[PDB]
Design a protein around this ligand. Structure first.
Ligand SMILES: [Mn+2]
Ligand SMILES: [Mn+2]
Ligand SMILES: [Mn+2]
Length: 430
DNA sequence: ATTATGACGCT
DNA sequence: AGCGTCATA
């Protein structure tokens, strides 16, 4: 009763850009705006692989992972923008730089955790308290929440979508108790007001639209964000969790989309997040381990404690390329040529990083895949990164891998390499 | 022949 | 350290 923690101590948001690489290309090329459009890498093999899709194009059934030739079958007028190629490989610099534009704006409101190239978590707890103090018990107007959905509302005793949104928002605001500065629902609502402001700033200052979720923890904020994409934000309250989770497939929750999630379903014979509440913490720990078991026990009740890390910058800088099928590297000079291409991109990015961010990488990680394997990576080895010099890094990378070559004579490389990966890690202040 | 990443957990 | 899992454009 008075002691059961409800996980309502924080206000956390997740901001995720809409169709991000597409919007980056649409800003650059006005001819792509408000069109079915996708971003593609490479072109020779089946028209290239699609990695981002505008919402107009999604309406035709175009998806990520699709070959552009096949997407064109669904959507003959689909417009395509190509990822830059430099040194023989896709180069994602334009999108990393666009990401920094957005992260820097978000950082004006609060410390952020960069969670991907196009999204970040924000702990708004402190900012909410201060906004509450200057509000002085004044109610929150619907006009401050022009793009906000309240998950689970309207409900109880209009056939248009914006009409439903406002109806739910009205029911929510009507019920609020703005008199209590410690009320979690009120705190989320003020959180949502701040995120409207954040999202407006992002759009004003970059031209990019985004969606967001506001809840009491990262997992619920992430889940919330997706509920009303694009260009909208969603508040998931603590009280909304039982209904939301009662029909929510387990795989939809971040971290359960893989093998663990499938094992939860198989072992327990359930389908939805809500069904987990019927197991003791010890039962869940017995099947899924101490850590996972406690995490699941709390998560299915809407409670999660993972903090928003104060980290705006990636903590690794890497370069990788696949060599599929026929193109698998089978000679020494081929392996060495591509190591150099990767190393030169890495050097360029590392040197820029040092100037911008006052830090230096100290470890180089080299990874390969061998034809006939199984796994994204076959072998991973590290060595010292002491100088930002492409020729040295590529020579070092070769040294760490040279023994993987099974071939008798050393001009040839066997068995052929299907992937090379260089990653700089272990940053220190400089 | 989805590819190019990037973070965290296990032992 | 090296491997595995999960995630996202
Ligand atoms: Mn996105
Ligand atoms: Mn994202
Ligand atoms: Mn996505």
């Amino acid at each position: 009763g008075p002691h059961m923690a409800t996980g309502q101590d924080r206000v956390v948001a997740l901001v995720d850009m809409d169709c991000f690489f597409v919007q980056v290309e649409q800003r650059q090329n006005p001819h792509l705006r408000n069109k079915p459009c996708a971003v593609v890498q490479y072109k020779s093999w089946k028209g290239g692989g699609i990695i981002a899709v505008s919402y107009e194009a999604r309406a035709f059934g175009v998806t990520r992972s699709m070959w552009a030739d096949d997407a064109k079958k669904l959507c003959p007028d689909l417009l395509l923008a190509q990822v830059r190629e430099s040194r023989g490989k896709a180069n994602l610099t334009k999108y990393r730089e666009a990401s920094v534009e957005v992260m820097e704006i978000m950082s004006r409101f609060a410390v952020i955790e960069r969670a991907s190239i196009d999204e970040a978590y924000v702990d708004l707890t402190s900012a909410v308290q201060e906004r509450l103090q200057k509000l002085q018990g004044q109610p929150i107007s619907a006009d401050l929440l022009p793009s906000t959905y309240i998950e689970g509302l309207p409900q109880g005793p209009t056939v248009q979508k914006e009409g439903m949104r406002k109806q739910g928002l009205f029911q929510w605001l009507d019920s609020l108790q703005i008199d209590n500065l410690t009320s979690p629902d009120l705190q989320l609502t003020v959180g949502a007001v701040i995120v409207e402001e954040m999202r407006a700033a992002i759009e004003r200052e970059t031209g990019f639209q985004c969606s967001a979720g506001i809840s009491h923890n990262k997992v619920l904020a992430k889940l919330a964000c997706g509920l009303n994409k694009p260009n909208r934000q969603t508040l998931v309250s603590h009280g909304s969790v039982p209904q939301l989770f009662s029909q929510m497939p387990i795989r939809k929750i971040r971290s359960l989309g893989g093998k663990l999630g499938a094992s939860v379903i198989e072992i327990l014979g359930i389908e939805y997040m809500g069904e987990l509440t019927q197991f003791t913490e010890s039962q869940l720990q017995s099947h899924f381990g101490e850590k996972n078991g406690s995490w699941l026990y709390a998560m299915c009740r809407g409670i999660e404690h993972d903090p928003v890390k104060p980290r705006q910058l990636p903590k690794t800088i890497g370069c990788s390329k696949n060599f599929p099928g026929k193109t698998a590297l089978a000679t020494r000079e081929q392996v060495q040529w591509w190591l150099l291409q990767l190393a030169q991109e890495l050097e360029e990015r590392l040197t820029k990083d040092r100037n911008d961010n006052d830090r230096v990488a100290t470890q180089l990680v080299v990874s390969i895949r061998v034809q006939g394997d199984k796994r994204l990576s076959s072998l991973r080895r590290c060595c010292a990164l002491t100088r930002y010099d492409a020729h040295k890094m590529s020579h070092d990378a070769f040294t760490v891998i040279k023994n993987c070559n099974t071939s008798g004579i050393q001009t040839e490389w066997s068995p052929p390499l299907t992937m090379l990966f260089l990653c700089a890690t272990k940053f220190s202040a400089s």
